[PDB]
């Protein structure tokens, strides 16, 4: 149980942050422990003097944390196969994915893959050539999503501003607990930024793209997510130690038919993480001390389409 | 209330009354006794025009160094309150404008008291009253004695006696009221106000048999 | 060329209705933000409140919403009422203006600025004393300067309350002027006086004429000194 | 740990005490380090 209040700001919010007085435990096993840390909203919820909270992790899986040696960061993989066989790379540079590969070459090994654990957008990964490549398994079908290939990178730079504490209580013997300090000066929240004028000029190639498969010429609309959980609806990914979860609205407001600034974006970190969805085992990502930054190239897209509607409209 | 007391010719610097949280717009004020408050530094270390340059408040670095006024080449002029008015990103409006540093500047020379003593009017003594008024000017420091003397002698009855208080001249000054009547001012042959400063006193003797 | 004057009652007894009226000059009303701040005997400084360009009133939650603003558009006056006074609200009281910072640490966006109110224009003032005892005109008398620069004046004695304000001449004569404290006497009354300073030969040829003001009672003397008839 | 004089174990504050259960000894074994074939 967690006694927590709206955390200390001057009005001006119509929180999220919280101030978690709670009783635990310490290395000792008789004395006990009273102390403080800051959560965001989204690892804990009420339960019904001043209101009190639990985490949300409590009545699903067990939960355990990541201890800060082991980093999340992306490290680039390459896959490889043994003797008497090998793998196959198809360079061919307008490639659907399907069907026959006109350019044909062996490896005994990918290039480097990053393991990026992310949504909704990809990050650090392979570039395509010339005309932006539009793969789908099948295109008539909504439901199968279709994945794209960038010639060109996209730049963005994605921050905690906040400067946080890592409070370190001991749960032991050799366990222990790394919890969040309050913020020191100004309270900001995360955010990443991208360049509007190769953002519209991209769904400018993009939709030269379209045309070719769809129309000559027609109407291309982009609108914000359905629904779903946190890790579909918002962009999930580890920036340092922190999974950001971040609003994409702005980007897809648009309506596109035939003929100096930049963007940004909101953003909410969350700790506890069930990401697989597997239950019974939750997991904790310790709080990284102070201004989080991490600079990512985007390689790739991932989307769905609607459904009939009007018939030959948009 | 801060006491704090700085020499002339020197550097002074004043921190703020409260801390700074998140990213600060610092409010320096100042205060004189009787007159109206001025403006030095707003948005931490802005000046407006008109203002010395001597005066430097602290900038904003992201946190750091508190809110400190540098005020260069101390003079005998700088002795009032200080307020810091911390505006910033956490404690929201600030309806207060912290403690208050009053500055004391020494290091002064010395001067001698200005004392007059007055007689009632000629309508004054037609009221049935009469108010032995003595005045004393330009004395630093602001330590002085008012006694009233019948005859030669010393007058404790009606001793209505102000307070010593700075001029515009960085000196005091103090007045004194011998509450009496028009009988008992001309009952006696000299009146002498005594006023004592710094060991010497200047002492102005009204008679009523001299014009 | 933005100036301003106040107006005080002079005295008020204890739970009525005090009111002060600042006026505007110089200036539009509409360019800028309007405060008015006071302080009590003994105590510091206290924030009050302030208005904008669309006229809405925010006050100091301190005050019990005891307290009202109103500015005049056409007047050019910036008044003020307060009522339920008490002994201990006796003070001196100010009008000054506020100009309106923004101080922005993070994106303008978010609302990481906030709003610091950095104060520029300021008034003069006037002084009011809460008290249950009546008001008491103040005794005005010429005192006779002597014969042997010399000095001459008059005296304010038993008045209540406070302020009384003493002229030469209706202002034509300035250099030389000093004002000594008043006392407070054991009945609760005071006793003030003032000194002009001049050159030796002036006596008799230049008209002395000190104009006494006790605003709280309404006490305007013009009285004049002349020299003893010795 | 700061009436009688209370105490606590040295390892709490460090790392999680197990304890070798008295089946198993600790008595040194000789052992004989070998090598595969090839080598
Ligand atoms: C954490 O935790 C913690 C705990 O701990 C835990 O446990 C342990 C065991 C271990 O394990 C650990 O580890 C853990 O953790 C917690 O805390 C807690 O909480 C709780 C909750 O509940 C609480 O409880 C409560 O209690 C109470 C009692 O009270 C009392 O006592 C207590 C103890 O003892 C205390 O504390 C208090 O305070 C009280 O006492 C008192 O007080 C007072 C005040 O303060 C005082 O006075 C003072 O004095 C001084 C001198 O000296 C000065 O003068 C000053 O000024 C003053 O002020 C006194 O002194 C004292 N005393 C003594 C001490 O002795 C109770 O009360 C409560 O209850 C209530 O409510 C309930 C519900 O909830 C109910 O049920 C009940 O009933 C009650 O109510 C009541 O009722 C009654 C009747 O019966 C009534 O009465 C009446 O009145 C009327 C008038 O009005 C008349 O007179 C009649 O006749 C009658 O009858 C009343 O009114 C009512 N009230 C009301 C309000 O309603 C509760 O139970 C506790 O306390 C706490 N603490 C502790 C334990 O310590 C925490 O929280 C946690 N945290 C987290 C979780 O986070
Ligand atoms: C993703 O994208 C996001 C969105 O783009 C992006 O968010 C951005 O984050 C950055 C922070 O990284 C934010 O940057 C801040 O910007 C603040 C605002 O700066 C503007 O305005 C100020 C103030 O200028 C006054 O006067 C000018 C002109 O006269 C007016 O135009 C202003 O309106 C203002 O007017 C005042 O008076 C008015 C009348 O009363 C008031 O109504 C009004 O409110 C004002 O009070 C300018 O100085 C700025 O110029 C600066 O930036 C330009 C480029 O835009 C440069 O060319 C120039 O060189 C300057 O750098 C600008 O126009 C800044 O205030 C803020 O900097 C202060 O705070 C930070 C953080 O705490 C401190 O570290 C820093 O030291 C600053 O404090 C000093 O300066 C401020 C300036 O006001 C003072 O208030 C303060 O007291 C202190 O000054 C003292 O020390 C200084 C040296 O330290 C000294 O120089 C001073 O003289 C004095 O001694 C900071 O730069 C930005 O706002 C976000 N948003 C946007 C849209 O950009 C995000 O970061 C991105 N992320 C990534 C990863 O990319
Ligand atoms: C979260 O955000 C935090 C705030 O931004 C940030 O932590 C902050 O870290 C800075 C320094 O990095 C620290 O600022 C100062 O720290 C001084 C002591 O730090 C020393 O040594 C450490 C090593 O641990 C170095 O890392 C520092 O750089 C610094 O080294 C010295 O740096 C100076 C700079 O030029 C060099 O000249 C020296 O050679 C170098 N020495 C070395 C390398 O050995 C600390 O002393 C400072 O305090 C003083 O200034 C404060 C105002 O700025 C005053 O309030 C305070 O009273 C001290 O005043 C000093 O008093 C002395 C004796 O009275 C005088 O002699 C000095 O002249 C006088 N100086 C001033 C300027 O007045 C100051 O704190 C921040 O304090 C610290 N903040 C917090 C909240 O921890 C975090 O890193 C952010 N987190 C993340 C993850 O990024
Ligand atoms: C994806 O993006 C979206 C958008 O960014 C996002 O968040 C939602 O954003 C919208 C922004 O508009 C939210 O607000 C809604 O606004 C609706 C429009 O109301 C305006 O217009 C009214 C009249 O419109 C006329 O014309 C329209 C269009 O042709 C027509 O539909 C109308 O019927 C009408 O003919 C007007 O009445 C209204 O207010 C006026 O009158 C009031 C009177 O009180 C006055 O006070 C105002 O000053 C003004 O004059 C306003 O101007 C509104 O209809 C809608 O509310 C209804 O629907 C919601 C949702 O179904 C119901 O909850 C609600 O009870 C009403 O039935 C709403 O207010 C919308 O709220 C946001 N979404 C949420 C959940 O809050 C998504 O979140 C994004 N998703 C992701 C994953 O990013
Ligand atoms: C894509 O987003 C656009 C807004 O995004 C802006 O920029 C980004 C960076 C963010 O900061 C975001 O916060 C910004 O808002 C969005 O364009 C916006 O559209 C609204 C209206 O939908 C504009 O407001 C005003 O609209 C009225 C007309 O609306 C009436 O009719 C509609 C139906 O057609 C009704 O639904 C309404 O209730 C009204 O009855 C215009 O008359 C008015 O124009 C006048 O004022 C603007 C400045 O505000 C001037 O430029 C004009 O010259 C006129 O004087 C407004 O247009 C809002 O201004 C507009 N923003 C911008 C930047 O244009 C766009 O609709 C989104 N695209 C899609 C497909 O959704
Ligand atoms: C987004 O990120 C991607 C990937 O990070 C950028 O895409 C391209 O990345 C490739 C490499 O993956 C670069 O292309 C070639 O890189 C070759 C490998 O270079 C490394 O190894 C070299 C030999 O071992 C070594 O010399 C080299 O060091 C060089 O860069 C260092 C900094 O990284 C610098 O300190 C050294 O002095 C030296 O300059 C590397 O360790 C290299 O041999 C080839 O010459 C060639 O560079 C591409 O240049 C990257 N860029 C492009 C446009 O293709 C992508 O650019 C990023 N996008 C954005 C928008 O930022
Ligand atoms: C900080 O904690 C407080 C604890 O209550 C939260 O305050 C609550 O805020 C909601 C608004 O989301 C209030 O509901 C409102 O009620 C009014 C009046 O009926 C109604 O007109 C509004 O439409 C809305 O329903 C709620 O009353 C209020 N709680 C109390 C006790 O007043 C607050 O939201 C917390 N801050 C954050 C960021 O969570
Ligand atoms: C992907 O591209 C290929 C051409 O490289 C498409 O062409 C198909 O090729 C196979 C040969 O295995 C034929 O049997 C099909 O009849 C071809 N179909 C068409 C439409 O040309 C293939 O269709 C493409 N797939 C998608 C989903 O676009
Ligand atoms: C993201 O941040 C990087 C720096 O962290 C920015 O890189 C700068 O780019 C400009 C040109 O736009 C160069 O002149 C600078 O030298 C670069 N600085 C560094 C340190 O690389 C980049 O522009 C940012 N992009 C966005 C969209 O904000």
């Known amino acids: 149980t967690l006694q927590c209040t709206n955390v200390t700001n001057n009005i001006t919010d119509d929180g999220e942050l919280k101030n978690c007085s709670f009783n635990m435990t310490t290395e000792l096993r008789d004395k006990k422990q009273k102390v403080y840390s800051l959560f965001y909203r989204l690892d804990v919820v009420q339960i019904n003097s001043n209101k009190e909270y639990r985490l949300i992790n409590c009545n699903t899986s067990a939960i355990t944390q990541a201890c800060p040696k082991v980093s999340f960061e992306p490290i680039p993989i390459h896959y490889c196969a043994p003797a008497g066989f090998a793998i196959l790379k198809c360079k061919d540079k307008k490639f659907n994915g399907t069907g026959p590969c006109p350019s044909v070459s062996t490896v005994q090994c990918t290039h480097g893959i990053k393991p990026v654990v992310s949504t909704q957008l990809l990050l650090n990964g392979s570039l395509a050539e010339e005309e932006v490549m539009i793969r789908s398994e099948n295109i008539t079908n909504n439901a199968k999503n279709i994945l794209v290939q960038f010639n060109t990178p996209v730049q963005i730079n994605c921050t905690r501003p906040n400067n946080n504490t890592r409070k370190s209580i001991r749960i032991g013997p050799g366990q222990a607990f790394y919890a969040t300090g309050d913020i020191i000066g100004d309270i900001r929240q995360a955010h990443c930024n991208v360049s509007k004028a190769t953002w519209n000029e991209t769904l400018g190639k993009v939709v030269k793209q379209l045309r070719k498969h769809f129309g000559n010429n027609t109407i291309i609309r982009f609108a914000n997510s359905s629904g779903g959980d946190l890790e579909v609806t918002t962009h999930s990914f580890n920036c340092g130690g922190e999974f950001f979860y971040c609003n994409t609205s702005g980007l897809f407001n648009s309506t596109w038919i035939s003929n100096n600034d930049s963007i940004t974006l909101p953003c909410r970190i969350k700790q506890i993480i069930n990401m697989w969805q597997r239950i019974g085992q939750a997991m904790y990502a310790p709080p990284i001390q102070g201004v989080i930054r991490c600079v990512s190239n985007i390689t790739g897209l991932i989307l769905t389409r609607d459904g009939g509607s009007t018939n030959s409209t948009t | 209330v801060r006491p704090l007391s700085v020499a002339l010719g020197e550097t002074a610097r004043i921190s703020c009354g409260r801390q700074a949280l998140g990213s600060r717009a610092v409010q320096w004020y100042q205060h004189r006794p009787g007159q109206a408050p001025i403006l030095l530094i707003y948005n931490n270390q802005d000046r407006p025009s008109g203002i010395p340059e001597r005066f430097s408040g602290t900038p904003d670095i992201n946190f750091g160094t508190r809110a400190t006024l540098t005020i260069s080449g101390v003079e005998a002029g700088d002795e009032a309150d200080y307020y810091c008015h911390m505006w910033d990103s956490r404690s929201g409006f600030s309806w207060s404008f912290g403690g208050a540093t009053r500055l004391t500047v020494l290091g002064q020379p010395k001067a001698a008291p200005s004392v007059t003593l007055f007689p009632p009017s000629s309508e004054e003594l037609q009221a049935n009253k009469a108010t032995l008024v003595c005045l004393i000017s330009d004395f630093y420091p602001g330590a002085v004695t008012v006694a009233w003397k019948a005859d030669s002698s010393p007058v404790k009855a009606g001793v209505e006696t102000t307070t010593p208080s700075k001029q515009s001249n960085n000196k005091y000054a103090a007045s004194s009221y011998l509450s009496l009547t028009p009988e008992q001012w001309k009952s006696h042959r000299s009146y002498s106000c005594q006023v004592t400063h710094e060991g010497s006193t200047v002492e102005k003797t009204v008679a009523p048999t001299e014009c | 060329q933005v100036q301003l004057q106040e107006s005080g009652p002079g005295l008020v007894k204890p739970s009525e209705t005090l009111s002060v009226t600042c006026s505007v000059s110089?200036?539009?009303?509409?360019?800028?933000?309007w405060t008015w701040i006071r302080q009590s005997p003994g105590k510091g400084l206290e924030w009050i409140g302030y208005?904008?360009?669309?006229?809405?009133?925010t006050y100091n939650p301190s005050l019990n919403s005891r307290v009202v603003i109103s500015r005049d558009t056409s007047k050019n006056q910036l008044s003020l009422k307060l009522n339920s006074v008490t002994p201990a609200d006796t003070a001196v009281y100010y009008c000054?203006?506020?100009?309106?910072?923004?101080?922005?640490?993070?994106?303008?966006?978010?609302?990481?600025?906030?709003?610091?109110?950095?104060?520029?224009?300021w008034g003069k003032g006037t002084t009011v004393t809460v008290s249950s005892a009546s008001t008491k005109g103040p005794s005005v008398f010429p005192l006779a300067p002597s014969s042997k620069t010399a000095a001459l004046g008059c005296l304010v004695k038993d008045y209540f309350p406070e302020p009384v304000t003493v002229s030469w001449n209706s202002g034509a004569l300035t250099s030389g002027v000093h004002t000594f404290p008043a006392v407070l006497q054991s009945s609760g009354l005071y006793s003030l006086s003032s000194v002009v300073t001049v050159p030796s030969s002036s006596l008799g040829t230049q008209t002395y004429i000190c104009n006494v003001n006790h605003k709280p009672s309404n006490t305007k003397v013009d009285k004049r000194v002349e020299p003893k008839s010795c | 740990i700061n009436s009688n004089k209370e105490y606590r174990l040295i390892n709490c504050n460090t790392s999680a005490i197990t304890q070798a259960c008295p089946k198993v000894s600790f008595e040194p074994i000789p052992i004989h380090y070998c090598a595969p074939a090839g080598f």
């Open positions: 208005i904008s360009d669309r006229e809405s009133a």
């Open positions: 000054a203006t506020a100009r309106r910072g923004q101080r922005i640490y993070g994106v303008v966006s978010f609302g990481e600025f906030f709003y610091y109110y950095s104060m520029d224009v």
């Open positions: 110089g200036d539009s009303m509409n360019n800028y933000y």
